[PDB]
């Protein structure tokens, strides 16, 4: 399986406004993805988290979702 950053451009980890990309590090549900699946370094992930949570308070990213099938 692909890790996110493996398929991706050279992109701001610090942009909370760009949803197109930030969406890719969310799960099927609103959950921020483990490093296992984001292929991100330690620092990187740590920044990514904070930029997500920002974006979330801005209504751009989902705080939580609902799971389909089941």
């Amino acid at each position: 399986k692909a890790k996110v950053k493996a398929t991706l451009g050279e992109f701001d980890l610090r942009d909370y406004r760009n949803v197109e990309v930030l969406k890719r590090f969310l799960s099927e549900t609103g959950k921020i993805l483990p490093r296992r699946r984001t292929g991100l370094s330690a620092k990187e992930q740590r920044i990514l988290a904070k930029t997500i949570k920002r974006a979330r308070i801005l209504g751009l990213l989902p705080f939580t979702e609902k799971l389909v099938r089941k």
Binding site: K66, L67, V68, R69, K70
Partner: protein, 116 residues
């Protein structure tokens, strides 16, 4: 005395019971059921069988209102949390979609002693 066509069907499962409410596409219920609604009383209510029959009884009771397409919402976990969706599938209701909506806090409330 509604004739509701398509509709939502929620399944709330616990370790103590299952209940199913069936409802209209804007959210108001139509009929419901539960392990205690049909025969069972004690612990017996949270068996998966009881979950089945609750599912069914509510779904036939929905036939009476004229239900056909149903969208499923599921909340909780218990035995026959699944068995209810199994019955509900082959019930004679065409299942639109299943969903798991189980509510979880972002960690706000102290739990009871049984829960930590």
């Amino acid at each position: 005395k509604r004739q509701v066509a398509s509709g939502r069907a929620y399944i709330h499962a616990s370790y103590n019971n299952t209940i199913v409410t069936i409802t209209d596409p804007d959210g108001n219920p139509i009929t419901w059921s539960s392990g205690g609604v049909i025969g069972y009383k004690g612990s017996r209510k949270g068996t998966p069988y009881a979950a089945q029959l609750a599912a069914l009884d509510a779904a036939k009771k929905a036939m009476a209102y004229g239900m056909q397409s149903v969208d499923v919402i599921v909340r909780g976990t218990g035995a026959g949390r699944e068995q209810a969706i199994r019955a509900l599938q082959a019930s004679g209701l065409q299942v639109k979609s299943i969903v798991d909506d189980t509510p979880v806090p972002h960690n706000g409330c102290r739990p009871k002693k049984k829960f930590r």
